[PDB]
Coordinates of C-alpha atoms in Angstrom, one line a residue:
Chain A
X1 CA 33.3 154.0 60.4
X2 CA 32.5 155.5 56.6
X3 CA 34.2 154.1 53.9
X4 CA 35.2 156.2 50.8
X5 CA 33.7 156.3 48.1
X6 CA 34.4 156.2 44.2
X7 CA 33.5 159.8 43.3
X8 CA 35.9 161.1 46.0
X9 CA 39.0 159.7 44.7
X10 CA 38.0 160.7 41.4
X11 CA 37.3 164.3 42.2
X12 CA 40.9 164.8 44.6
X13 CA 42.8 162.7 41.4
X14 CA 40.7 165.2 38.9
X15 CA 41.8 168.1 41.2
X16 CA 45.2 167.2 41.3
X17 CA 46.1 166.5 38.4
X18 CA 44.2 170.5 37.1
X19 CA 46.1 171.9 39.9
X20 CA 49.7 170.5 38.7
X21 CA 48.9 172.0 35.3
X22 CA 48.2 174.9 37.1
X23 CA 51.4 175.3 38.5
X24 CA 53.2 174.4 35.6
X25 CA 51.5 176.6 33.2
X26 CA 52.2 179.3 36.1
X27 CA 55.9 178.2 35.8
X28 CA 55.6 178.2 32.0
X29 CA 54.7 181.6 31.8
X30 CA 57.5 183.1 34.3
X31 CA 60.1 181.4 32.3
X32 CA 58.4 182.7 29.1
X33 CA 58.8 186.0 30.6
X34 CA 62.0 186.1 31.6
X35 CA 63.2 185.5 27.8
X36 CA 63.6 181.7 27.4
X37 CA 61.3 179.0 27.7
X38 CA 63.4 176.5 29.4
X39 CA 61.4 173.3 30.9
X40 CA 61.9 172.2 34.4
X41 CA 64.0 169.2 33.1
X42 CA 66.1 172.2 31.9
X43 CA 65.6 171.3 27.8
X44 CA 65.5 174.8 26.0
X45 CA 62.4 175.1 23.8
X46 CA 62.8 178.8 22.6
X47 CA 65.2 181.3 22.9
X48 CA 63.8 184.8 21.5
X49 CA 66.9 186.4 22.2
X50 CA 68.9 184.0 19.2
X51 CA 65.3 183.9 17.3
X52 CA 65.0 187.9 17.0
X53 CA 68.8 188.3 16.9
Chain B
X1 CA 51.8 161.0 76.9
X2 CA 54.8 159.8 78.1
X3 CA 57.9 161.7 76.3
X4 CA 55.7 163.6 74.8
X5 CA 54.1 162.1 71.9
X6 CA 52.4 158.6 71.1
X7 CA 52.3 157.9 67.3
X8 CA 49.4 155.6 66.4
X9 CA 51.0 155.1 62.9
X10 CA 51.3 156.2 59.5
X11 CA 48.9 154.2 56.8
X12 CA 50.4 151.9 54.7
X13 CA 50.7 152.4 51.3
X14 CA 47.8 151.4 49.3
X15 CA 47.9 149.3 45.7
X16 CA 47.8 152.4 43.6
X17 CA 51.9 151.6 42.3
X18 CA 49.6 150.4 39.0
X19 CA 49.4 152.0 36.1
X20 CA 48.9 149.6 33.3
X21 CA 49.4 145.7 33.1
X22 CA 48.3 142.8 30.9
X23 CA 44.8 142.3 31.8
X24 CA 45.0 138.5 30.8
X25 CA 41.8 136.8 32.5
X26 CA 43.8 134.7 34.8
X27 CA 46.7 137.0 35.5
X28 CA 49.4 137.6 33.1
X29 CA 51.8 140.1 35.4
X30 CA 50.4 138.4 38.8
X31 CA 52.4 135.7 40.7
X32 CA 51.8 133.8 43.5
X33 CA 54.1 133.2 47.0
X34 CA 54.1 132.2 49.8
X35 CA 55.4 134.3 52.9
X36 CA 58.2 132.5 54.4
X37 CA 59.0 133.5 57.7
X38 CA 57.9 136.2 60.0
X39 CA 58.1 138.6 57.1
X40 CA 56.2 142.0 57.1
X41 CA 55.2 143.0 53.0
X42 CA 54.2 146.2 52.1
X43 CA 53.1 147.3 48.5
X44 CA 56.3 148.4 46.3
X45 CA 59.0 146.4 47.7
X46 CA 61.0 144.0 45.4
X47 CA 61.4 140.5 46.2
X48 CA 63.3 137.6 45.1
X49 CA 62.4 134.3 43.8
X50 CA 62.0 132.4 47.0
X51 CA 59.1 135.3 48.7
X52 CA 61.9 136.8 50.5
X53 CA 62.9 140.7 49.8
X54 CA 66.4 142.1 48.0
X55 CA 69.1 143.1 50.0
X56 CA 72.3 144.6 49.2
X57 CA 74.7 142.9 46.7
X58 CA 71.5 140.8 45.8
X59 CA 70.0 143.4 42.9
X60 CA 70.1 140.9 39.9
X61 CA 67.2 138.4 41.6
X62 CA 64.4 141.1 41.8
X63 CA 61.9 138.8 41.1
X64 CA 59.0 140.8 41.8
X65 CA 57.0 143.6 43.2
X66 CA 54.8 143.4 46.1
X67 CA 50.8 144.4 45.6
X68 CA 49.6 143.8 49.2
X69 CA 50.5 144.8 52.4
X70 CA 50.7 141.3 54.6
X71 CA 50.8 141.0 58.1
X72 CA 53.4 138.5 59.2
X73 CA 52.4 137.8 62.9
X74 CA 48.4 136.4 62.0
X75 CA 49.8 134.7 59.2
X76 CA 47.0 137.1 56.7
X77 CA 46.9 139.8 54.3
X78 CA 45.9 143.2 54.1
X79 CA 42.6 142.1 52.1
X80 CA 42.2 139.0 54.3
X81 CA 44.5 136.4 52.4
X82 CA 46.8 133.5 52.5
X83 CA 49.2 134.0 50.8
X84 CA 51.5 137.3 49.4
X85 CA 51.2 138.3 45.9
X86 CA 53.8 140.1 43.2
X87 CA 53.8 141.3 39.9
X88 CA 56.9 140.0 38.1
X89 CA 56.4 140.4 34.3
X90 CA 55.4 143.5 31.5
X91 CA 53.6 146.2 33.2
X92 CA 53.8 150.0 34.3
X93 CA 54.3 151.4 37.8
X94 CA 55.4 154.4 39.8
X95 CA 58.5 154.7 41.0
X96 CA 57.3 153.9 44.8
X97 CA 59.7 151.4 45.0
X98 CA 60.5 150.3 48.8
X99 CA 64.3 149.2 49.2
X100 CA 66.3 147.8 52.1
X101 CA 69.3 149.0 53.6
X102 CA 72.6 149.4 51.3
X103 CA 70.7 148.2 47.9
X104 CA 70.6 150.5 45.4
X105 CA 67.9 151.3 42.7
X106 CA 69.5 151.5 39.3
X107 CA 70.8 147.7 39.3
X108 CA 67.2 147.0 40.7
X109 CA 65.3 149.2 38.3
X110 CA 67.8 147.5 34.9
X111 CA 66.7 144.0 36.5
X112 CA 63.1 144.8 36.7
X113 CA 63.0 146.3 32.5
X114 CA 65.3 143.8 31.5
X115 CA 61.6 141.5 32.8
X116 CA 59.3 143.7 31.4
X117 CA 58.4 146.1 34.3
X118 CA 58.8 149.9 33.7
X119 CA 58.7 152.6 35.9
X120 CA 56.7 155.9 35.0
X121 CA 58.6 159.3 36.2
X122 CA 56.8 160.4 39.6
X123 CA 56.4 163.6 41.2
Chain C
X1 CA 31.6 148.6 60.6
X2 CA 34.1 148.8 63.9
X3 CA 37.5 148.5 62.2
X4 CA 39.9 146.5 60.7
X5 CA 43.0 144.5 61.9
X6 CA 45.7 145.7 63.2
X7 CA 45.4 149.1 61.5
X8 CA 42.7 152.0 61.9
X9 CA 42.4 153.5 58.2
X10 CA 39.9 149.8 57.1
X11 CA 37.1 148.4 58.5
X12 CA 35.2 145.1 58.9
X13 CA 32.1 143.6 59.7
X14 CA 30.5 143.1 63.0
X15 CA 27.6 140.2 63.4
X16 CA 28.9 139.2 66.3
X17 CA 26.9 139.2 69.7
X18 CA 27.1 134.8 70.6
X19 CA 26.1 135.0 73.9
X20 CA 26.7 132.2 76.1
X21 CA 24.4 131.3 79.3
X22 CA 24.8 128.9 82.1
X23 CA 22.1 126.3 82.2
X24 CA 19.9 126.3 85.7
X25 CA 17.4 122.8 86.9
X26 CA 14.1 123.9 88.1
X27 CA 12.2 120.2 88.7
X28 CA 12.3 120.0 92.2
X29 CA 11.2 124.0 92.8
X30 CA 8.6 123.7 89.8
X31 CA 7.1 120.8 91.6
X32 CA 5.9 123.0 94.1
X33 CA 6.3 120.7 97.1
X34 CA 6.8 122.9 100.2
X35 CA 4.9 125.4 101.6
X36 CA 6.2 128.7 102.6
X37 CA 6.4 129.0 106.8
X38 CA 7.2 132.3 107.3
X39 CA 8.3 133.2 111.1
X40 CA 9.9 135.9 113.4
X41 CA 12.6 134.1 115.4
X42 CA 15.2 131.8 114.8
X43 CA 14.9 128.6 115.7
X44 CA 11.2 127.2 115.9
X45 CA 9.7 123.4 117.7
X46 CA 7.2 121.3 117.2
X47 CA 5.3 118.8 119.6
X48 CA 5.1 115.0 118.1
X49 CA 2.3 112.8 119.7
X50 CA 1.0 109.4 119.1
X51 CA -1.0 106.8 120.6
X52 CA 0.5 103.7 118.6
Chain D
X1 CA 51.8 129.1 57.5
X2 CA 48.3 130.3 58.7
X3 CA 47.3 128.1 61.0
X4 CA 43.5 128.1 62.2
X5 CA 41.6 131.6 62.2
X6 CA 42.8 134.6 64.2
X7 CA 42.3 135.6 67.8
X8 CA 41.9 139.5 68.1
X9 CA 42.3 139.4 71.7
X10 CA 40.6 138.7 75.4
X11 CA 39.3 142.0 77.2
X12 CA 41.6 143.0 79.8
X13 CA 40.0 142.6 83.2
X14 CA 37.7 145.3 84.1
X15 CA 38.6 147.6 87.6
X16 CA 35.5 146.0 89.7
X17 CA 37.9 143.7 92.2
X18 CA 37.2 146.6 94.4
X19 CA 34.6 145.3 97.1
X20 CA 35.2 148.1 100.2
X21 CA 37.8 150.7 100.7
X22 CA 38.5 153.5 102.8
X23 CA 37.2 156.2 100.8
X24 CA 38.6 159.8 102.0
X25 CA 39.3 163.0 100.2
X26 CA 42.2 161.3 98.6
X27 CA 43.8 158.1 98.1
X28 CA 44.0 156.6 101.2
X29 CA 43.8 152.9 100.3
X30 CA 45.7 153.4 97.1
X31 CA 49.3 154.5 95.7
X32 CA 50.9 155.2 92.6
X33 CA 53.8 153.5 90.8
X34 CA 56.2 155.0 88.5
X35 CA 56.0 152.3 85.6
X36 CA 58.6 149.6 85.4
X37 CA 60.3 150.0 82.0
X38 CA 59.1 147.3 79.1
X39 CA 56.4 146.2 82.3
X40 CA 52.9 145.1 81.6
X41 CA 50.3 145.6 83.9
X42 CA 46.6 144.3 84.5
X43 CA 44.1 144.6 87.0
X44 CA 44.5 142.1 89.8
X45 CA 48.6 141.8 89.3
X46 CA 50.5 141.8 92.8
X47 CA 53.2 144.3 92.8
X48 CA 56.0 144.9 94.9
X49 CA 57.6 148.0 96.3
X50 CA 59.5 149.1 93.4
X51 CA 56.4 148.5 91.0
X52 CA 57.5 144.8 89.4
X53 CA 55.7 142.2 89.8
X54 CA 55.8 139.2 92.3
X55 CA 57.6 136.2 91.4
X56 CA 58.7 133.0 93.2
X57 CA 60.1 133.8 96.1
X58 CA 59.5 137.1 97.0
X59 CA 55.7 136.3 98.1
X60 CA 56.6 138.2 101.5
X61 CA 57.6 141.1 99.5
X62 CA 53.7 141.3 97.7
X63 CA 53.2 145.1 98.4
X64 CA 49.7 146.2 96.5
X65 CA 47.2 144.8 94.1
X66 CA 47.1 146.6 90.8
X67 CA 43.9 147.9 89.6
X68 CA 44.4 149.9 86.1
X69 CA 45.7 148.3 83.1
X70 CA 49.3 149.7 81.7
X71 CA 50.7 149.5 78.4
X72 CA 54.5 148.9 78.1
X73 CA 54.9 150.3 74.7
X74 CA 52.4 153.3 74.9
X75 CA 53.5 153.9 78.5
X76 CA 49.8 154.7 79.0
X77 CA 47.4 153.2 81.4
X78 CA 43.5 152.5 79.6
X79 CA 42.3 155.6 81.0
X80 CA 45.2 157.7 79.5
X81 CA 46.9 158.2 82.9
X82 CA 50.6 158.4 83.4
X83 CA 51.5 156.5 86.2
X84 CA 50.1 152.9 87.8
X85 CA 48.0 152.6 90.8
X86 CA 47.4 149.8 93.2
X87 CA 45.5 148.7 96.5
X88 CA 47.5 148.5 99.3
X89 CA 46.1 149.3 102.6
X90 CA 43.1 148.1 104.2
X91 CA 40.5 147.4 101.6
X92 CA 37.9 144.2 100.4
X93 CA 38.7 142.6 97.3
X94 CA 37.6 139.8 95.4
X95 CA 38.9 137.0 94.8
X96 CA 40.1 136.9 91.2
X97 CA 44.1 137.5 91.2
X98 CA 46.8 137.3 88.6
X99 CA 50.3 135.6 90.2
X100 CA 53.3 134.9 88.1
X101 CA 54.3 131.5 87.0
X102 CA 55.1 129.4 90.4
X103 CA 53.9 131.8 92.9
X104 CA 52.4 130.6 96.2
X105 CA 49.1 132.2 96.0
X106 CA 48.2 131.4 99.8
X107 CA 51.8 132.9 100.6
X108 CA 50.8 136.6 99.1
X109 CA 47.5 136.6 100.5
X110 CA 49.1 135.9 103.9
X111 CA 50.4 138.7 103.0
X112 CA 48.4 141.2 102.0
X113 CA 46.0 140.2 105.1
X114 CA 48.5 141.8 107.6
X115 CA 48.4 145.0 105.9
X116 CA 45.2 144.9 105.8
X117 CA 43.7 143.5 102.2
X118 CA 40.7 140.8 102.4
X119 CA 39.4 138.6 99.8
X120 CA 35.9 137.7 99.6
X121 CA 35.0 134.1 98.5
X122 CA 34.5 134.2 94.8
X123 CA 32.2 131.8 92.6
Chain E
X1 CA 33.5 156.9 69.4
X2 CA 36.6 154.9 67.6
X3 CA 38.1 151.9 69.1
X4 CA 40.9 152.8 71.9
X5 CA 44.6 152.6 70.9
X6 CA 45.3 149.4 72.4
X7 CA 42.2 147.4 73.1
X8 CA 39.3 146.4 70.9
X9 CA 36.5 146.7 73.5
X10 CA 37.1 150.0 75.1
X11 CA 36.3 153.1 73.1
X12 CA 37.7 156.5 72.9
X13 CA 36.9 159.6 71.0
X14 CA 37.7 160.5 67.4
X15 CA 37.8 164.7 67.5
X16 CA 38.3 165.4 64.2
X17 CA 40.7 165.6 60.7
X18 CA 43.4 168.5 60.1
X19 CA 44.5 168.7 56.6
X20 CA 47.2 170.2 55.1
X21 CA 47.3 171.6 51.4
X22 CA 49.9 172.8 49.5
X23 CA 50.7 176.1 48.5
X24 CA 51.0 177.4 45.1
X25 CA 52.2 180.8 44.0
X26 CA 49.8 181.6 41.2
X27 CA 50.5 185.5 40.8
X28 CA 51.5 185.9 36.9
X29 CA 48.8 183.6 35.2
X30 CA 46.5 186.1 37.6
X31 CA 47.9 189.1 35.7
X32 CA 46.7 188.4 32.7
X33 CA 49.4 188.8 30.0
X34 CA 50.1 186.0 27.7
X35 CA 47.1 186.2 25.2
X36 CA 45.3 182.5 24.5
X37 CA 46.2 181.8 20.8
X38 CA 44.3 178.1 19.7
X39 CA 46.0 176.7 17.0
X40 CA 45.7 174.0 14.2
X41 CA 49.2 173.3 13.5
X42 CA 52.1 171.5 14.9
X43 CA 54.4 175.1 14.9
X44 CA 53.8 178.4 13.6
X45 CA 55.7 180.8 11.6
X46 CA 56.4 184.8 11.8
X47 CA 57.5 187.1 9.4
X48 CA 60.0 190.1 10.8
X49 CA 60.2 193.1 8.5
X50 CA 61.8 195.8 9.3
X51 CA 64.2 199.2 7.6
X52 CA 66.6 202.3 8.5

């Protein structure tokens, strides 16, 4: 019978949300590696191949 | 238990679908029914004009939204209420739409914008 | 704080606790009338006499 | 259409009909049930020999006196058990019973006194 | 102590929570790489020289 409070929500939203960026940035950096940096939507951002001919 | 398993229930969805409304002092986005019938509401399902929900072939009423989760059988609401509550004009809300059998979302989703209601991307 | 309605994730108030209690009459016992006779056997006599 | 406040419920009776059995190393005076499907039971419900209930009519057939309360959709009893028990042989109950609609009550305690089942006067 | 499943006055026995997290595969952000380069602008430029 405890009820939740405030600063729990905002701590697991807070958590969340640096997690997800997390993940992406760890996404990010594989594509980035792997020679173009293609979002997950699949939108091409930078091809270093074309760019460094 | 018997066959195995008893499932106690999963908790129903809670009124976080918000993410940004008018904030008018006497509710600009908020409207007011009136459940009509033996009628279980949850947050995030669409509903037409007359309290009742969207069903298939029915997409271009989509009055509303639901915000509460009423309880049809005691006649109250999931915060104690009378009375079942949607949000039917300009505000933002994930995708955590709740649809019937055979309706679809994109004619429900044009119907809702075409109001004022648009849907952030959810992941 | 027991729970709520019809689902176990909220929670409600309690107060509660209206007890309800028969009412009893006392008058004729709290008048005290009769005197306690205590005996051993079951049935018991008593010898009436008078010289009208 | 809320009508009134809201009744949460009455307590199910509690197992205390039980005045005097014949107490042994197992069961003597009481026998288990497999559940009747979609069934309800409470404690102080007549049953007969397949585990229903007694209705009009079949007052001869009364078989045992149930004493555990059974769920129909959890298929539970209140103490987590699996199956329903009941009183049938020789035993002292009180007088508090539970008959379905039109049922002779003098008719099943007839009954249940030739297999052995008393009722103590109740106030 | 909880209420039971299916009455309101008899109690039963709350044991405990089990949660489940998500995994996440952070391996090459861990190795250390890509070097952090803050910048002021909206996009950068690079110059490539290079002969035979």
């Amino acid at each position: 019978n405890e009820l939740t409070t405030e600063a729990v929500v905002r701590a697991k939203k807070l958590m969340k949300i640096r997690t997800k960026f997390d993940i992406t940035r760890e996404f990010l950096f594989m594509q980035a590696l792997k020679g173009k940096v293609i979002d997950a939507n699949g939108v091409l951002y930078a091809d270093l191949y074309k760019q460094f001919d | 238990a018997y066959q195995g398993f008893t499932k106690l229930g999963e908790r129903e969805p809670l009124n976080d679908i918000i993410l940004w409304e008018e904030i008018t002092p006497t509710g600009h986005s908020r409207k007011e029914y009136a459940p009509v019938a033996s009628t279980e509401y949850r947050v995030g399902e669409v509903l037409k004009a007359d309290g009742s929900k969207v069903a298939a072939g029915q997409e271009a009423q989509a009055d509303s939204v639901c915000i509460v989760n009423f309880y049809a059988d005691l006649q109250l609401s999931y915060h104690g209420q009378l009375k079942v509550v949607g949000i039917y004009r300009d505000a933002e809300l994930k995708d955590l739409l709740k649809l019937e059998s055979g309706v679809d979302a994109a004619a429900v989703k044009s119907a809702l914008k075409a109001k004022g209601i648009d849907f952030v991307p959810t992941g | 704080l027991t729970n709520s309605e019809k689902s176990r994730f909220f929670l409600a108030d309690l107060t509660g606790e209206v007890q309800s209690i028969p009412n009893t009459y006392g008058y004729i016992s709290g008048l005290g009338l009769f005197r306690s006779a205590p005996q051993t056997q079951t049935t018991f006599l008593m010898d009436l006499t008078d010289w009208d």
